[PDB]
Design a protein around this ligand. Structure first.
Ligand code: MG
Length: 831
RNA sequence: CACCCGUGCAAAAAUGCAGGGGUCUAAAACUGAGCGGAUAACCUC
RNA sequence: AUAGAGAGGUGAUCCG
């Protein structure tokens, strides 16, 4: 269940020295200081509108009741008593540390000094989360540019201007000429038609053509170094690269500007023309406000998407206040779409113009409160009794073409302003945001939303912590290398602006004559009907993902692996399966899937042979085959993203512990060194000769491995691991070779229980293929033998090569025990 | 059906009841996840 | 000269 303390409004419980501070929820993510406690003595800080009050205060707990929404009573634990409770021989009361014991080093890196409080560590961890998510969504981008090859993108740095790169053409060193020849080969690929916004430009003659060679190199280099910086841990001045993007060479800035300006120029030029009808009608019904200001407000409402960020579902509000009314009838379907939207502005302006005060009641009652529906019903009730006359007037203002059309050929505009208050061009947006947009040209669909939303959340959290620290009187002055975060408010605004217009995709150019072959190969076809299948397969949203992150001919072969297809169809609900079968073949639920899996695997041209039903049949078959293939590839890529997180964390924590004084060894040649440094064990003659003892458990470097049980399990697993196996596992995960060779690695599978099993079977088979020609250790040989015998992923083998993540117990258990892996498909623990 | 911590009852190294964790994990809370199911709309093939 | 289908924007709709 949700935390009762958060229901009462206790946002956070900070600790500063011998004092503990409690905060409440303000507007949005802002925080308001409420109470301060000094050893059972308390003095409230917010008096104008308290969110909660303390009833009984003891050294080991604080009791609250809350005043807003449901009066829910709750108890909060004193942060100063953490790790200092009963059975600990009554230790002193002190400020807590993070589980990795990296709080002193992390604070000394981002700030100049150690701090006696726990506010700064949360800001540092949010920055770490930003880097973590950038690693995931950057390693996927380079994979897209690697896939089209059917190396260069590694070790590509931003201190090499294209004026220098061209000199490499006649260079006598073969290792450099091969690097240049890789670039020459890359730009001639027809698959560069995909990711159009990053490599193609529009010009009059008008048609789309490739950019110049200079601009293409800048895009590849910028994305290339983003991966290298966000996966490796650079040494020297290069480690602050993302936070010092103002120092880039002129070529990289110009390409970023040109890429960023295209959508902002498209949208901002059509605003008046595309929305003229709505503006005039809204100004007719809202004539009390000046037209010049009023049209500016509508820019905030729709173009900037401000009306959806208010903290509650305005969609639900409108749905609940338009209950059972005649103007919403289907007989006005030609108006209903606009009637809702013009009602939405009437809704949005209310909580800003006049009734801004009482939006707090709605945003707080919902939080303190499933039974949350009646809150919407009550709130929607007042909405009608006030806005009935207003929205009914709009309901007839839109009536008839006499206004829905006369609003266009009137051709009257204010036209007086100099195009101000719009979305900013490239000259005003910071370089950090412009690099995010370039990264999003290569991701697809939900990934864009995930990345942008996560970035917005983390930056907002950083801003809230900074404001709290300003209120408390603490020092926040970042080090000179990290001045990037001082203006976090500015970077938040640009990302919120970006989320409004980012297209979540990049539409391909009008050169689909080349995509004909790929679209035919994805079905294994290779007259007249062929062009129809090509036209339908292309422009299907699920085909865009398949041809970017996969190879068309390889995808068809994996459709022949029956268990992989059968598992995907089981995830589709029973109602949907019935719909497909009704269209695909004009019975038992289980048997319906079996017949469907037979047809999707053996799809041929002959299967595609009045005419209306046959046209509809082929549309269903294409939609089904692409849907199944999209689901399997998406899940495998997302699972592989979980391990790039783990390896990024390993390579970051290695350097973090290096500064703390713990000897770690060279992480490159053996990736299990970090977990050996934490447990205080050292390799000797290639094996761990130190047996288990309770003394080593107590002297562990971090709190995770002070668990007596889990030290033994990890130590037992390290003995079974091998250096080469872990290195090849690292190489496979970061370059996504497990998905690149889905053609071979999935051939002999027997049963797929979840996407965890399917993913780890692909990696283990790849490891078998890689080491079949070389000597292996006895444990690896036993694991390979078990894999061959059972034809399913060996559970013990997973615990072997996932050992470099052992220093973080939670991450180790999540990435080695099935069921604890995915939060959407929970399962029982197996340890 | 993950990890850590506090508290109370039972126990010699541990069990249970009840809580907290933006400082545990992709993981604090407020717009139930939408990843499936298509309609009139301006414009495109 | 005329007739296809997916796109920024909203109803539909099932899921725990
Ligand atoms: Mg966190």
């Amino acid at each position: 269940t949700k935390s009762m303390a958060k229901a009462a409004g206790v946002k956070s419980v900070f600790a500063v020295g011998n004092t503990v501070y409690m905060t409440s929820f303000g507007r949005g993510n802002d925080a308001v200081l409420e109470q301060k406690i000094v050893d059972t003595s308390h003095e409230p800080l917010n008096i104008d509108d308290p969110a909660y009050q303390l009833n009984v205060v003891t050294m080991n707990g604080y009791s609250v009741t809350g005043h807003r929404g449901e009066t829910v009573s709750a108890v909060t634990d004193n942060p100063l008593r953490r790790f200092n409770g009963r059975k600990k021989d009554e230790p002193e009361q002190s400020v807590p540390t993070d589980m990795l014991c990296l709080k002193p080093t992390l604070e000394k890196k981002f700030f100049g000094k150690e701090f006696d409080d726990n506010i700064h560590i949360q800001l540092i961890y949010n920055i770490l989360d930003i880097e973590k998510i950038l690693a995931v969504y950057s390693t996927n981008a380079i994979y897209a540019l690697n896939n089209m090859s059917a190396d260069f993108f590694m070790k590509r740095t931003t201190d090499e201007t294209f004026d220098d790169f061209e000199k490499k053409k006649e260079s006598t060193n073969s290792r450099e000429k091969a690097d240049f020849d890789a670039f020459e080969k890359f730009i001639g690929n027809y698959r560069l038609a995909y990711f159009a916004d990053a490599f193609y430009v529009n010009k009059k003659n008008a048609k789309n053509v490739l950019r110049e060679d200079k601009e293409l190199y800048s895009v590849l280099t910028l994305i290339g170094k983003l991966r290298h910086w966000c996966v490796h841990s650079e040494e020297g001045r290069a480690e602050f690269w993302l936070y010092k993007l103002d120092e880039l060479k002129d070529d990289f800035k110009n390409v970023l500007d040109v890429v960023y300006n295209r959508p902002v120029e498209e949208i901002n030029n059509r605003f008046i023309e595309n929305n003229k009808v709505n503006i005039q009608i809204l100004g007719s019904v809202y004539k009390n406000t000046d037209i010049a200001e009023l049209v500016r407000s509508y820019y905030e409402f729709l173009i900037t998407k401000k009306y959806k960020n208010m903290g509650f579902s305005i969609k639900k509000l409108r749905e609940s206040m338009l209950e059972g009314k005649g103007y919403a009838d289907k007989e006005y379907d030609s108006v209903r779409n606009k009637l809702y939207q013009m009602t939405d502005f009437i809704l949005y302006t209310g909580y800003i113009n006049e009734d801004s005060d009482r939006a707090d009641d709605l945003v707080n009652t919902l939080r303190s409160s499933d039974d949350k529906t009646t809150v919407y019903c009550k709130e929607a009730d007042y909405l009608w009794k006030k806005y009935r006359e207003s929205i009914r007037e709009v309901a007839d203002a839109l009536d008839g073409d006499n206004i829905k059309k006369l609003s266009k050929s009137n051709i009257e505009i204010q036209e007086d302003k100099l195009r101000k208050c719009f979305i900013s061009y490239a000259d005003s947006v910071s370089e950090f945001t412009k690099l995010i947009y370039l990264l999003t040209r290569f991701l697809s669909g939900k990934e864009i939303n995930d990345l942008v939303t996560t970035l917005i959340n983390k930056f907002d959290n950083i801003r809230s912590f900074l404001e709290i620290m300003d209120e408390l009187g603490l020092d926040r002055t970042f080090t000179a290398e990290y001045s990037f975060f001082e203006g976090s408010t500015k970077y938040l605004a640009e990302l919120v602006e970006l989320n409004s217009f980012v297209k979540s995709c990049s539409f391909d150019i009008n050169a689909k004559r080349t995509m004909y072959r790929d679209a035919l190969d994805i079905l294994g076809i290779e007259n007249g009907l062929r062009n129809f299948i090509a036209s339908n397969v292309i422009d299907s949203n699920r085909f865009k993902y398949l041809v970017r992150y996969g190879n068309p001919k390889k995808i068809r072969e994996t459709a022949k692996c029956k268990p992989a297809v059968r598992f995907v169809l089981n995830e589709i609900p029973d109602a949907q399966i019935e719909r497909y079968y009704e269209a695909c073949c004009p019975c038992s639920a289980n048997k319906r899937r079996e017949k469907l899996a037979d047809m999707i695997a053996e799809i041929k041209f002959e299967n595609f042979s009045s005419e209306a039903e046959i046209k509809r049949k082929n549309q269903a078959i294409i939609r089904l085959y692409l849907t199944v293939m999209y689901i399997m590839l998406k899940n495998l890529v997302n699972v592989n993203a979980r391990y790039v997180i783990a390896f990024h964390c390993v390579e970051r924590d290695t350097k973090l512990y290096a500064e703390s004084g713990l000897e770690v060894g060279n992480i490159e040649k053996n990736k299990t060194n970090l977990t050996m440094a934490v447990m205080g064990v050292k390799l000797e003659n290639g094996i761990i000769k130190t047996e288990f003892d309770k003394s080593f458990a107590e002297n562990a470097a971090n709190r995770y491995l002070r668990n007596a049980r889990w030290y033994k399990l990890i130590l037992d697993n390290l003995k079974k691991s091998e250096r080469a196996v872990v290195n090849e596992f690292r190489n496979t995960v970061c370059h996504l070779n497990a998905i690149r060779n889905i053609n071979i690695n999935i051939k002999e599978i027997k049963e797929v229980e979840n996407y965890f099993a399917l993913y780890h079977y692909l990696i283990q088979k790849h490891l078998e293929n890689r080491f079949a020609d070389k000597k292996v250790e006895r444990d690896t040989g036993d694991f390979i033998s078990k894999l061959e015998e059972h034809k399913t992923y060996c559970k013990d083998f997973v615990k072997a090569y996932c050992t470099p993540f052992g220093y973080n117990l939670v991450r180790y258990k999540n990435l080695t025990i099935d069921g604890l892996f995915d939060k959407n498909y929970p399962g029982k623990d197996d340890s």
